[PDB]
């Protein structure tokens with residue numbers, strides 16, 4: 001996260017770190033056994049880390065659970081990042097408490113202008129490189145469809161939305177991928193892509209979760 005702030009330990013209790021020997025992507029806990037992330041975060045040998053603040057120190061509230069199964073969206077396109085969504089099942093159920101908690105799925109899609117909370121352990125620099133140890137947060141608004149498509153002509157599907165600041169300086173970045181965008185208490189987005197981070201006229205692009213709620217529900221009911 002570029003130009004964000006320190007969240008505060010366990011104030012975002014649905015935030016997970018995906019670990020394959022090192023943190024590489026975020027995710028969201030949506031019930032005691034399931035995590036939503038980005039399909040481009042796919043890899044084998046995922047361990048899901050819940051209750052994290054400092055991802056390099058064991059602070060006492062963590063739960064480390066291996067994934068039993070990953071399921072990339074059937075229509076995921078790795079060229080365009082259309083349908084950039086994946087489900088991860090945990091080998092055992094997480095214990096839910098004040099520090100580990102699920103986030104609700106949306107019943108209806110979010111509206112342009114709505115302020116949302118984006119979080120992760122990704123790069124905090126615009127052009128350089130610095131990765132944080134504690135969880136970073138950012139408030140950012142959903143941008144109109146028209147301004148999104150203007151920023152990224154010929155690249156935006158109806159399964160994507162833009163959020164952020166056209167003036168630049170505030171954005172998600174690499175290492176935040178797969179993490180949450182939470183608006184009005186619902187998971188509305190997944191950190192997907194962007195042209196650089198925090199650049200003028202290049203806002204963040206997010207997977208539009210409300211288009212996938214049927215697929216998530218049926219997949220969880222069968223696996």
Ligand SMILES: [Ca+2]
Nearest residue numbers: 054057058059
């Ligand atoms: Ca930790």
